[PDB]
Design a protein around this ligand. Structure first.
Ligand SMILES: OC[C@H]1O[C@@](CO)(O[C@H]2O[C@H](CO)[C@@H](O)[C@H](O)[C@H]2O)[C@@H](O)[C@@H]1O
Length: 263
């Protein structure tokens, strides 16, 4: 059976032609609202949260790790390098790389975080260490975005990503300074205006990370502080049947607007 929330999300999905996955956690009472919440979806750049968090975890026992400069060579650049291109033949610290990955969705920056963690499997291992049994990172940028229907590579479920984002930002999967740093980064994201944020009441504070990829995959994950009530975590994943489908950030905004009703 469905609730009216789920029915609205199903109708949005039907109209969009694609496949929508939603998970809301309301931390007032730790209830969840799910739509396809246990189905896998391609994460695309939403995986950058796990990678940044994994580096923050490393920094809990190496307090200057975040300030460590990393060389950016010409050959490091991939398909979308808005920050890293400014530093070719220079450096970016792991903090600068995290900020670029999270706040600009820089793919070179993500590949440096992945390298810091020893490869995609290092990101997955961090996920398992914080109780995320679902996340898997298989590939680097840009191939982690191929988003092929049903392919389990580089996927998670909405429920698992919401539980993890709660643990990382409101819980204590990270140390105190590190959790605050992740929240600061997410809150300052520059790429999210058309996605979840566009569907929320404007008085609400939010941190988010978007993703996009082939098959018109359009994603966003957010930690949200509504005005006068306990925070929320919201995941909205969306993917489409044809490889060259257009982005649909508006679907995410719509999903958020549905979920916000009654909150
Ligand atoms: O940023 C370079 C760094 O990224 C990794 C992946 O974490 O490799 C990616 O970038 C290379 C150079 O652009 C690509 O050849 C490679 O296929 C891609 O995965 C690291 O291996 C590398 O140190």
């Amino acid at each position: 059976q469905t609730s009216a929330v789920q029915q609205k999300l199903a109708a949005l999905e039907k109209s969009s032609g694609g496949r929508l996955g939603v998970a809301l956690i309301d931390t007032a009472d730790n209830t969840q609202v799910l739509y396809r919440g246990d189905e896998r979806f391609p994460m695309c750049s939403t995986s950058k949260v796990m990678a940044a968090a994994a580096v923050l975890k490393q920094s809990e026992t190496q307090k200057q790790l975040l300030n460590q400069p990393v060389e950016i060579k010409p050959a490091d650049l991939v398909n979308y390098n808005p920050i890293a291109e400014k530093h070719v033949n220079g450096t970016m610290t792991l903090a600068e790389l995290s900020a670029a990955a999270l706040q600009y969705s820089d793919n070179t920056a993500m590949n440096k975080l992945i390298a810091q963690l020893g490869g995609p499997g290092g990101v997955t291992a961090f996920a398992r260490a914080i109780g995320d049994e679902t996340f898997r990172l298989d590939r680097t940028e840009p191939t982690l975005n191929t988003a092929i229907p049903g392919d389990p590579r580089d996927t998670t479920t909405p429920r698992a990503m919401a539980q993890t984002l709660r643990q990382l930002t409101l819980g204590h999967a990270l140390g105190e300074t590190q959790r605050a740093q992740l929240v600061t980064w997410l809150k300052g994201n520059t790429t999210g205006a058309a996605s979840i944020r566009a569907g929320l009441p404007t008085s609400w504070t939010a941190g988010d990370k978007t993703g996009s990829g082939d098959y018109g995959t359009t994603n966003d994950i957010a930690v949200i502080w509504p005005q006068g009530r306990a925070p929320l975590v919201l995941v909205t994943y969306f993917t489409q049947p044809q490889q060259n489908a257009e982005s649909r950030r508006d679907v995410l905004a719509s999903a958020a607007r549905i979920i916000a009703e009654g909150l």
